[PDB]
Amino acid sequence: PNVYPAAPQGGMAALNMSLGMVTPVNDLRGSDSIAYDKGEKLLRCKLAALYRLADLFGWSHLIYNHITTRVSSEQEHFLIVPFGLLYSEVTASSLVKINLQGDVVDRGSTNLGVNQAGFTLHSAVYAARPDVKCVVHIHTPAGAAVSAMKCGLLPISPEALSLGEVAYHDYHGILVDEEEKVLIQKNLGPKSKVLILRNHGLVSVGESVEEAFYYIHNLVVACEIQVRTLASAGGPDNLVLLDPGKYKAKSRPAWQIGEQEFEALMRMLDNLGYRTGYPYRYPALREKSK
Amino acid sequence: FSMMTPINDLHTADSLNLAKGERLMRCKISSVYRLLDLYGWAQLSDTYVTLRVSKEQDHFLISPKGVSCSEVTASSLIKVNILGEVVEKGSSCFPVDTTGFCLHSAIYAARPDVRCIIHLHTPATAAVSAMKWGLLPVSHNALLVGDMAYFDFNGEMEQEADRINLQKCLGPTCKILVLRNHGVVALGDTVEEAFYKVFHLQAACEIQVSALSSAGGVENLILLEQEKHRPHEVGSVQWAGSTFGPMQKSRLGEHEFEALMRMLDNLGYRTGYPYRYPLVQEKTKHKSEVEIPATVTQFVPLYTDPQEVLDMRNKIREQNRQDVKSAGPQSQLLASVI
């Protein structure tokens, strides 16, 4: 079966599994990896797998949003999806390595170009913080609902309180270059790994891909909690609130942060047959046996 | 594309020390994890479902950390003591973390009646728990939920004061514990009853969320009260089965669990759950007058030569051609007289 049968409301996910069957993401082979770096080869795997995983959960809105990662092997480089190709068809070799200013370092496997306007915000965030290596910008249907609301995010769920401090950026939407960039830069100071745009969507930064995915998934879950909680009562009927610092104090060779859920989802993606090629801390579900 | 995983690999692995009843308990408690996965209420393990093995020795079945609900098998689950130390480890290569078990232990020290615990983190249940009001009796499912207790949860259950406060406020006879801003906890004597209550809470939570979203205010919902009538839900599950005798008597969640578990067995999930009510498909019977009943319920030796026969007849025919005179055989009695 080239195409899986479609649910009444889940056809796009079924096509995502079908395209996972048809086109593997580990496009790099032994002969096809000539004149290519090792760390970049490792990072393209994670980035392409993240693009493939983003469309499955529904956090993909055509080609308007982008997910960027930073490789600090050379002086100055970044990776991004080419413009004009959706999330469900992204492979490791099809990703484009570009400069901070948007200059295309190498064309890559694909022929299509790169959008500078989408990369402007990512460039602003990357130039603002040197420690940030991954930026994920998504637009879920509940996230723009909570973002356009006056009060903003509320400490209603432990997922919301796991985010800690959150930054807010007002949507003026004039997008004239450098001064928009500097408003982005000093509207998000030190730390504050989660940024909320008032109308465009949600964005999370992270030192690694796994940590950024964990933060954005916590933000999405907390948003889904917050919408249903505040829909019933929106004011003097006091929904139960927790102190952030005080509940955080009571919340309180080891496994790294964010790798557990990411590796479990890689176990999904390999069980289906996407052939992700993600490096596994524990490649076997069960023990050694024979 | 192979999402079928065998849920009972105890016989295949043969590398574990099982107790008197582990063969049934492990499959029974992995089935509910698979059902939670299929309904999509939870996919990433936060130690949702815990089981108690025996009353004489307090051992408890919990899921290993870092294992998704799709990957849960019966042999992969581990058993621990009430303090939290590992007694016997499953056939899963993962670091052992029993941090989330302690809250479940806070249930086990209080009530000896409860045997299985399910914790829910669904958006609807958390919306109802975080709501200022509780589960409002506005639906039939909320009436079938029953009485319930609310408690404030703050992330730790390790000091003695929080544990004794929870055991005091939980009460002697309560089945549902609502943790504020965290969700719901269902207590069960049996796995089927607790899964029944989990399903009814999820349905009632979704109904309440949709209802309070639809109408601004509680007074517009014209809710009924459970207390005024005080029914005993008598007369439910009237049965006219043919194989067994017709009785009203059934447990709270057996009949719903049997069908789900037979669903699981049909595809190829090799579950070891014993069905209380056996099922047989048979072809239907006819009572047309056309149908007629059935009536019932070396001679030759192995090594020989044809050329020998031909040579023999040639020897006889040669004597015929020669015509040599020869007398017949004589008796030995006449041989004596000569």
Binding site: - | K283, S288, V290, E291, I292, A294, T295, V296
Partner: protein, 371 residues
Amino acid sequence: DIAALVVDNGSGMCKAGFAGDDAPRAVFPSIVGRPRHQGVMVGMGQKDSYVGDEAQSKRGILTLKYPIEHGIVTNWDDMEKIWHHTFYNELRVAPEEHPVLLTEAPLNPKANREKMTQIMFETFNTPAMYVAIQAVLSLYASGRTTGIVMDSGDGVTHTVPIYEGYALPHAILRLDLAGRDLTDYLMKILTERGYSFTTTAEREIVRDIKEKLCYVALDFEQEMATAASSSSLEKSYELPDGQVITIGNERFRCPEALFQPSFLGMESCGIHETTFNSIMKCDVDIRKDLYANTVLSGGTTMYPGIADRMQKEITALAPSTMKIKIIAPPERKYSVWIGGSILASLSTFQQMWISKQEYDESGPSIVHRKC
């Protein structure tokens, strides 16, 4: 009220009756006799040839020959004589007024159907005639549309499976082991007792003996032991000339050639093995129904104990989980005609008749177009 005619032909028996009746009107052997002795009696009744029931009365002065052997006609003129006797002497109805229904074996050469159609339109001016499969009509007489049927006549034995009213042509199995060959074998094994039968009338006498005093053994070796060790399995037949013979051991020996053709030396397998192979040739999904519905047809299957032995032999080759049952209607001799009496009575069957006028532009091959 013009009603159709159903005429069932088999080697040794011809039946005929009006459509929609419970009983056929005429049943008589398909025999043709010609005088053999010098006829010297001036003025009294002599004829060139006798046919039907009248010929069987005068077996002493007649040579009796069958026009059909093994379901294939040998002399068409004798077949015309039998058909004329059936249409005129037995039923006393005009053949050109009523339609006639005809039956035949499933597997047969090309020329038989064409010659039969040509003779039936040209000689008798039949306005409409149709050809049907015998075993399919027997299954319709049982009243189930599915199952595998075994029809064993005096000409040939054949098993066909029918699923949802369709007989699969690939799964049809035909074995040339019939009751006339059993009669010849019974004559050969009665030779060794001291009684000798050579003429054709003596063959009919042997056939009557076989019909009266034969049965099927459940266990062959045990019945040989019982018959050798005791005289309980002995009956006496009384010949038409007054002589008395003792059938003795041979009673279960003649029908056992149906199950083991090694007695006759035939290369083919037994009848139960033939039925089992015919079931094997079908699809798996329907095999349950093929093991659930099996009916016996034909006069050869009237031997006592045929159903029990058939069920045991099929169960031996069948899988252990399968359920085997055998249906044997008491009127299994005339089932085929009964099915014909069903098939002509339907309101959708009047359009199934072959038009007389359409044959004029089509020709003798028209049945292959319509049947």
